[PDB]
Design an enzyme around this catalytic site. Structure first.
Site, PDB file in Angstrom:
ATOM      1  N   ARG A  61       7.685  36.051  23.241  1.00 45.50           N
ATOM      2  CA  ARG A  61       7.420  36.798  24.470  1.00 45.50           C
ATOM      3  C   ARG A  61       6.050  37.441  24.369  1.00 45.50           C
ATOM      4  O   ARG A  61       5.847  38.354  23.563  1.00 45.50           O
ATOM      5  CB  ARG A  61       8.487  37.864  24.711  1.00 45.50           C
ATOM      6  CG  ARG A  61       8.207  38.723  25.916  1.00 45.50           C
ATOM      7  CD  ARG A  61       9.290  39.751  26.120  1.00 45.50           C
ATOM      8  NE  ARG A  61      10.564  39.171  26.527  1.00 45.50           N
ATOM      9  CZ  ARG A  61      11.736  39.735  26.277  1.00 45.50           C
ATOM     10  NH1 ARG A  61      11.824  40.870  25.597  1.00 45.50           N
ATOM     11  NH2 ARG A  61      12.849  39.146  26.709  1.00 45.50           N
ATOM     12  N   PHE A  81       0.200  44.014  27.877  1.00 44.83           N
ATOM     13  CA  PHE A  81       1.204  44.897  27.283  1.00 44.83           C
ATOM     14  C   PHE A  81       1.456  44.636  25.798  1.00 44.83           C
ATOM     15  O   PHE A  81       1.152  45.497  24.967  1.00 44.83           O
ATOM     16  CB  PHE A  81       2.496  44.817  28.098  1.00 44.83           C
ATOM     17  CG  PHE A  81       2.337  45.324  29.507  1.00 44.83           C
ATOM     18  CD1 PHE A  81       2.319  46.687  29.769  1.00 44.83           C
ATOM     19  CD2 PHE A  81       2.190  44.443  30.561  1.00 44.83           C
ATOM     20  CE1 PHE A  81       2.146  47.179  31.075  1.00 44.83           C
ATOM     21  CE2 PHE A  81       2.017  44.923  31.873  1.00 44.83           C
ATOM     22  CZ  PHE A  81       2.012  46.306  32.122  1.00 44.83           C
ATOM     23  N   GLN A 134       5.523  39.884  21.298  1.00 35.25           N
ATOM     24  CA  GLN A 134       6.819  40.116  20.658  1.00 35.25           C
ATOM     25  C   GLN A 134       7.300  38.864  19.933  1.00 35.25           C
ATOM     26  O   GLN A 134       7.223  37.752  20.474  1.00 35.25           O
ATOM     27  CB  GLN A 134       7.854  40.553  21.703  1.00 35.25           C
ATOM     28  CG  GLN A 134       9.239  40.876  21.155  1.00 35.25           C
ATOM     29  CD  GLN A 134      10.177  41.374  22.235  1.00 35.25           C
ATOM     30  OE1 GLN A 134       9.737  41.885  23.260  1.00 35.25           O
ATOM     31  NE2 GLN A 134      11.489  41.235  21.999  1.00 35.25           N
ATOM     32  N   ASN A 173      14.472  46.223  20.445  1.00 35.19           N
ATOM     33  CA  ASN A 173      15.884  46.529  20.257  1.00 35.19           C
ATOM     34  C   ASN A 173      16.657  46.251  21.534  1.00 35.19           C
ATOM     35  O   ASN A 173      16.090  46.003  22.599  1.00 35.19           O
ATOM     36  CB  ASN A 173      16.108  47.993  19.793  1.00 35.19           C
ATOM     37  CG  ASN A 173      15.668  49.027  20.822  1.00 35.19           C
ATOM     38  OD1 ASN A 173      16.081  48.993  21.976  1.00 35.19           O
ATOM     39  ND2 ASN A 173      14.796  49.950  20.403  1.00 35.19           N
ATOM     40  N   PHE A 181       7.311  44.123  18.122  1.00 34.31           N
ATOM     41  CA  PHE A 181       6.227  43.827  19.053  1.00 34.31           C
ATOM     42  C   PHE A 181       4.950  44.533  18.626  1.00 34.31           C
ATOM     43  O   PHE A 181       4.980  45.579  17.966  1.00 34.31           O
ATOM     44  CB  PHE A 181       6.576  44.188  20.502  1.00 34.31           C
ATOM     45  CG  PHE A 181       6.838  45.678  20.749  1.00 34.31           C
ATOM     46  CD1 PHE A 181       8.047  46.257  20.398  1.00 34.31           C
ATOM     47  CD2 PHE A 181       5.882  46.457  21.390  1.00 34.31           C
ATOM     48  CE1 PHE A 181       8.288  47.615  20.658  1.00 34.31           C
ATOM     49  CE2 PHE A 181       6.097  47.797  21.652  1.00 34.31           C
ATOM     50  CZ  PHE A 181       7.326  48.383  21.291  1.00 34.31           C
ATOM     51  N   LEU A 190       7.597  53.793  26.162  1.00 36.20           N
ATOM     52  CA  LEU A 190       8.467  53.351  25.080  1.00 36.20           C
ATOM     53  C   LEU A 190       8.675  54.419  24.010  1.00 36.20           C
ATOM     54  O   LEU A 190       9.529  54.233  23.137  1.00 36.20           O
ATOM     55  CB  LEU A 190       7.894  52.074  24.445  1.00 36.20           C
ATOM     56  CG  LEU A 190       7.736  50.916  25.423  1.00 36.20           C
ATOM     57  CD1 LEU A 190       7.168  49.669  24.707  1.00 36.20           C
ATOM     58  CD2 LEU A 190       9.049  50.586  26.130  1.00 36.20           C
ATOM     59  N   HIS A 218      11.715  53.100  21.004  1.00 40.86           N
ATOM     60  CA  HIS A 218      11.435  52.079  20.005  1.00 40.86           C
ATOM     61  C   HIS A 218      10.771  52.756  18.820  1.00 40.86           C
ATOM     62  O   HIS A 218       9.909  53.619  19.005  1.00 40.86           O
ATOM     63  CB  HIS A 218      10.520  50.972  20.596  1.00 40.86           C
ATOM     64  CG  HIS A 218      11.146  50.268  21.759  1.00 40.86           C
ATOM     65  ND1 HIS A 218      11.830  49.077  21.623  1.00 40.86           N
ATOM     66  CD2 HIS A 218      11.265  50.626  23.062  1.00 40.86           C
ATOM     67  CE1 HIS A 218      12.325  48.721  22.795  1.00 40.86           C
ATOM     68  NE2 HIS A 218      11.988  49.638  23.687  1.00 40.86           N
TER      69      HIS A 218
END
Ligand SMILES: CCn1c(-c2cc(N3CCN(C)CC3)cnc2[C@H](C)OC)c2c3cc(ccc31)-c1csc(n1)C[C@H](NC(=O)[C@H]1C[C@@H]1C)C(=O)N1CCC[C@H](N1)C(=O)OCC(C)(C)C2
Ligand SMILES: Nc1nc2c(ncn2[C@@H]2O[C@H](COP(=O)(O)OP(=O)(O)NP(=O)(O)O)[C@@H](O)[C@H]2O)c(=O)[nH]1
Ligand SMILES: [Mg+2]
EC number: 5.2.1.8
Lengths: 162, 169
Positions: free
Chosen positions: A53, A58, A61, A100, A111, A120, A124
């Site tokens: 991903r 951004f 991942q 997660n 990531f 976040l 995370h």
């Protein structure tokens, strides 16, 4: 604080080496998970797995080495382990943080931020940062998309501890 | 030419939106947890003796991003509003999803189907009559589904196409 490396490949062609500082002074359990998965010393780990991903603007991942589709992965402590702490924040590009499925579901997916992702924070666990090769992570964004699906296979061809 | 229908699947995280969509598109059941960012699919189907093209937006139920639903609610023609029959909270989230769709569309009359998913599971906490009553007060159909067994999957998407068709005409 230990240092690990990923040698990144794009459809099997080398892209270059990214190195990470692991914040063992603040999150020793989480850092040790990533360190051991990078060496493979428990008999499994990141070598050969992909970044499934990638969303430009951004983050990148990866880390699903059990199912290779974004749904798998496991830690050295078991399939899941608890959120160690949220001391560190997603302050900008290069932050290394755990993916997660909600509270206390850390496994092996992680990531790398390519921007500040402040919302976040507290959700995370941040446990490391890119040391060398941030432009390689920026270059991985060239193969991402709006929903994260990648246009080429981005893999960890080799990885270990420095 | 074939008529295209823009369907959008919404509902709380983990209710089975993607599992239902992948059952419709690919005829198999995803047992794994793969939380959605956003995915789009195309499928042609014969409904009431006519072929049409379904364009299906599978959306994120992730509660953090509730302020970023406006664009897809503007373009979608009809909405599959999914809860899970073993998750009372997801049923309560339905009212909020519907109001949000009405607010973005600025309309009390939007093609919608209420979908109670995971009907294969024994641990039921939402009563069929309770969802039937709620759908009746909305003026929309209600269908119980299972993405695991395929129960009601075709019927839910086909019923929404019928609702959209009635709205276009
Ligand atoms: C509204 C659309 N959307 C968006 C979004 C948000 C914005 N903003 C603009 C304004 N600013 C101020 C706020 C945000 C803009 N554009 C989009 C996207 C590009 O529009 C399509 C996101 C997102 C995340 C999820 C669902 C929908 C989502 C989601 C769904 S499961 C999830 N997150 C958490 C995810 N669990 C997993 O994978 C589990 C399976 C493994 C074990 C996870 O641990 N990580 C790590 C951290 C990053 C996260 N993945 C991820 O991929 O974040 C994508 C990102 C783009 C960063 C956020
Ligand atoms: N027993 C059963 N499990 C189901 C059913 N539909 C989905 N599930 C399961 O429930 C979990 C969540 O499914 P998923 O389709 O990913 O839900 P979602 O609504 O798309 N989640 P998100 O909003 O994060 O994208 C998965 O483990 C899936 O296998 C169903 O009808 N029955
Ligand atoms: Mg989904």
């Amino acid at each position: 604080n230990p240092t690990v490396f990923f040698d990144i490949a794009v459809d099997g062609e080398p892209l270059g080496r990214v190195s990470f500082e692991l914040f063992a002074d603040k999150v020793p359990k989480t850092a040790e998970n990533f360190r051991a998965l990078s060496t493979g010393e428990k008999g499994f780990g990141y070598k050969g797995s992909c970044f499934h991903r990638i969303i430009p603007g951004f983050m990148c991942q990866g880390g699903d080495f059990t199912r290779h589709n974004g749904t798998g992965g496991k830690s050295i402590y078991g399939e899941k382990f608890e959120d160690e702490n949220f001391i560190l924040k997603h302050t900008g590009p290069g932050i290394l943080s755990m993916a997660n499925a909600g509270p206390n579901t850390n496994g092996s997916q992680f990531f790398i931020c390519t921007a500040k992702t402040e919302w976040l924070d507290g959700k995370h666990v941040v446990f490391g940062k890119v040391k060398e090769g941030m432009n390689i992570v920026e270059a991985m964004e060239r193969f991402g998309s709006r929903n994260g699906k990648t246009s080429k296979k981005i893999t960890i061809a080799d990885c270990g501890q420095l | 030419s074939m008529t295209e229908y823009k369907l959008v699947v919404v509902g709380a995280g983990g209710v089975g939106k993607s599992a239902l969509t992948i059952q419709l598109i690919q005829n198999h059941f995803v047992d794994e947890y793969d939380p959605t960012i956003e995915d789009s699919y195309r499928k042609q189907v014969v409904i009431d003796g006519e072929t049409c093209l379904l364009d299906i937006l599978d959306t994120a139920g992730h509660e953090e991003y509730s302020a970023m639903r406006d664009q897809y609610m503007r373009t979608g023609e009809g909405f599959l509003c999914v809860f899970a029959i073993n998750n009372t909270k997801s049923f309560e989230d339905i009212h909020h999803y519907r109001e949000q769709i009405k607010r973005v569309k600025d309309s009390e009359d939007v093609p919608m189907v209420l979908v109670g998913n995971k009907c294969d599971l024994p641990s039921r906490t939402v009563d069929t009559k309770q969802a039937q009553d709620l759908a009746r007060s909305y003026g929309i159909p209600f269908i119980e589904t299972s993405a695991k067994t395929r129960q009601g999957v075709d019927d839910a998407f086909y019923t929404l196409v019928r609702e959209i068709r009635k709205h276009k005409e």
